[PDB]
Amino acid sequence: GITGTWYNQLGSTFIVTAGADGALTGTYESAVGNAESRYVLTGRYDSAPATDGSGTALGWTVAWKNNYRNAHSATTWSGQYVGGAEARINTQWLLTSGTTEANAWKSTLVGHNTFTKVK
Amino acid sequence: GITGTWYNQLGSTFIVTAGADGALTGTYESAVGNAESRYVLTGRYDSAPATDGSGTALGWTVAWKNNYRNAHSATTWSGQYVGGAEARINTQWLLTSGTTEANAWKSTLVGHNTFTKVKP
Amino acid sequence: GITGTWYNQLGSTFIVTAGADGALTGTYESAVGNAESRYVLTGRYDSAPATDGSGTALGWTVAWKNNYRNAHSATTWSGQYVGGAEARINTQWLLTSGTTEANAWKSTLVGHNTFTKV
Amino acid sequence: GITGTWYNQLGSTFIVTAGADGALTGTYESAVGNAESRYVLTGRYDSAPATDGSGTALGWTVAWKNNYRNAHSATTWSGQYVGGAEARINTQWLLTSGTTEANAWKSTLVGHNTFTKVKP
Ligand SMILES: O=C(O)CCCC[C@@H]1SC[C@@H]2NC(=O)N[C@@H]21
Numbered sequence: 001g002i003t004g005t006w007y008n009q010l011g012s013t014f015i016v017t018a019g020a021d022g023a024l025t026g027t028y029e030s031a032v033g034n035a036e037s038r039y040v041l042t043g044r045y046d047s048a049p050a051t052d053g054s055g056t057a058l059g060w061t062v063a064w065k066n067n068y069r070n071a072h073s074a075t076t077w078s079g080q081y082v083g084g085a086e087a088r089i090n091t092q093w094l095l096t097s098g099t100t101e102a103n104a105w106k107s108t109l110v111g112h113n114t115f116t117k118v119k
Numbered sequence: 120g121i122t123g124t125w126y127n128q129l130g131s132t133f134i135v136t137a138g139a140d141g142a143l144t145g146t147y148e149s150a151v152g153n154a155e156s157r158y159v160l161t162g163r164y165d166s167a168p169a170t171d172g173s174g175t176a177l178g179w180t181v182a183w184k185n186n187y188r189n190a191h192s193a194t195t196w197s198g199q200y201v202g203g204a205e206a207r208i209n210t211q212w213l214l215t216s217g218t219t220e221a222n223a224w225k226s227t228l229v230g231h232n233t234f235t236k237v238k239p
Numbered sequence: 240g241i242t243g244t245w246y247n248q249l250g251s252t253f254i255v256t257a258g259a260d261g262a263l264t265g266t267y268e269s270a271v272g273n274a275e276s277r278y279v280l281t282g283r284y285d286s287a288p289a290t291d292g293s294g295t296a297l298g299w300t301v302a303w304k305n306n307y308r309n310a311h312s313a314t315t316w317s318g319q320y321v322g323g324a325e326a327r328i329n330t331q332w333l334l335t336s337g338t339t340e341a342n343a344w345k346s347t348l349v350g351h352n353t354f355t356k357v
Numbered sequence: 358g359i360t361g362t363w364y365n366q367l368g369s370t371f372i373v374t375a376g377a378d379g380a381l382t383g384t385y386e387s388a389v390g391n392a393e394s395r396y397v398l399t400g401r402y403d404s405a406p407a408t409d410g411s412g413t414a415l416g417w418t419v420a421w422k423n424n425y426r427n428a429h430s431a432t433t434w435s436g437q438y439v440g441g442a443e444a445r446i447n448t449q450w451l452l453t454s455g456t457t458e459a460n461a462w463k464s465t466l467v468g469h470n471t472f473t474k475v476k477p
């Protein structure tokens with residue numbers, strides 16, 4: 001159920017393939033921030049989740065460097081996939097920018113993104 | 120650089136290879152939690168960082184399933200590599216467990232881990 | 240404004256008074272977790288926000304001890320009040336439980352709550 | 358144990374009084390950021406912590422407005438006090454700035470601060 005195209009509330013698009021062994025691979029296009037076009041993502045998911053209706057744990061990373069630009073930053077999303085009629089990937093994220101040691105205290109933004117199969 | 124064997128303040132072991140086009144691959148062994156032995160990790164790093172003294176942004180994920188056990192959880196680490204005499208990787212992390220909808224509010228732990236190449 | 244009775248997506252009830260000195264005071268009742276009835280809260284907000292359409296920054300704390308129960312934990316909410324026609328308070332929160340030193344790595348939960356007066 | 362002056366790794370100073378009723382009141386001076394001089398803080402703590410000597414849960418808020426400046430922002434710290442010879446308050450924090458709705462996704466910084474009774 002994870003493989004495919006997902007949309008979040010910001011207008012971003014997350015295109016992922018879930019491998020049999022726990023691999024996530026794909027591309028991410030952000031509607032906001034210091035970003036243009038698609039970026040490589042990689043991550044992992046629980047490939048033998050519980051079957052009690054609980055979600056499937058997963059996470060992925062994007063480093064915000066592609067052929068077009070480099071924001072000198074990286075985001076990780078941690079969350080879970082919930083299937084069914086209203087399928088969702090519910091996440092929290094951490095965006096770290098490369099900083100000097102003196103500015104390290106303000107290096108990391110936190111937020112939440114909910115991904116759905118329709119936008 | 121980033122490639123090597125790293126240890127955090129909990130005694131966990133992070134073995135990573137940084138590929139030329141931005142890939143991180145390796146293994147993670149946690150000294151704590153519902154975990155034993157090594158788990159696969161993948162991630163990304165900025166393969167052309169700024170040259171002004173800024174760190175190198177990176178992140179990686181571990182899903183806590185291996186041949187021995189499955190915690191039905193995953194952790195991401197977001198942070199930066201800081202080079203120099205004593206290299207460091209400074210991170211914050213999010214650990215999400217699979218939950219029911221009613222328990223989703225308590226799905227995710229947050230913390231910080233600093234990694235160095237110094238064995239416990 | 241901020242003063243009033245607010246509810247989040249979990250069904251918790253946040254009753255707050257915003258003082259002109261930047262103080263928040265009131266009570267919190269959680270619909271979830273190791274909690275019953277009302278808990279005291281205190282916090283702060285920006286009492287002279289920007290006039291350019293930006294939200295009003297705020298935060299508050301609840302320690303989960305009252306006359307009935309003690310969870311040995313505390314939550315902080317950090318966020319902003321958005322005054323539109325349908326006012327909201329959008330937050331992220333940290334819940335720290337008291338732990339031993341060896342379990343401190345797993346002391347703190349993170350999440351998000353959005354509050355409305357509906 | 359909590360009442361007094363505390364220092365973090367950034368060089369900031371936290372002066373707090375812990376009331377019998379669970380109240381934290383005091384002032385905070387940040388060494389970094391859009392801040393000068395002292396700011397009011399208020400918070401809460403567990404006035405009856407566990408008998409097994411676990412830490413004492415607590416939190417507090419600073420809105421970054423005083424008589425000298427207004428950053429249009431607020432920080433909350435959530436953590437625990439640990440007593441004894443090397444007493445500490447170990448925290449994670451969230452700093453939210455007032456933003457437009459369009460910029461709300463980048464409103465909130467996260468970090469960690471460890472407070473000690475002696476300045477590092
Ligand atoms: O500005 C940057 O440094 C790079 C772009 C970051 C976009 C962030 S990642 C978290 C959030 N979710 C999104 O879809 N976009 C923003």
Ligand SMILES: O=C(O)CCCC[C@@H]1SC[C@@H]2NC(=O)N[C@@H]21
Nearest residue numbers: 131149152153154183190192194
């Ligand atoms: O308990 C689990 O669900 C799996 C093991 C989690 C271990 C965590 S990941 C964040 C922190 N840093 C570590 O090295 N170990 C813990």
Ligand SMILES: O=C(O)CCCC[C@@H]1SC[C@@H]2NC(=O)N[C@@H]21
Nearest residue numbers: 251269272273274303310312314
């Ligand atoms: O379980 C505990 O330790 C005490 C109750 C915590 C309830 C949490 S606070 C964050 C979230 N928002 C709510 O309204 N309730 C939960």
Ligand SMILES: O=C(O)CCCC[C@@H]1SC[C@@H]2NC(=O)N[C@@H]21
Nearest residue numbers: 369387390391392421428430432
């Ligand atoms: O820049 C601002 O908006 C106001 C000052 C924020 C300073 C932050 S609060 C978290 C961290 N810990 C500190 O002692 N200082 C920084």
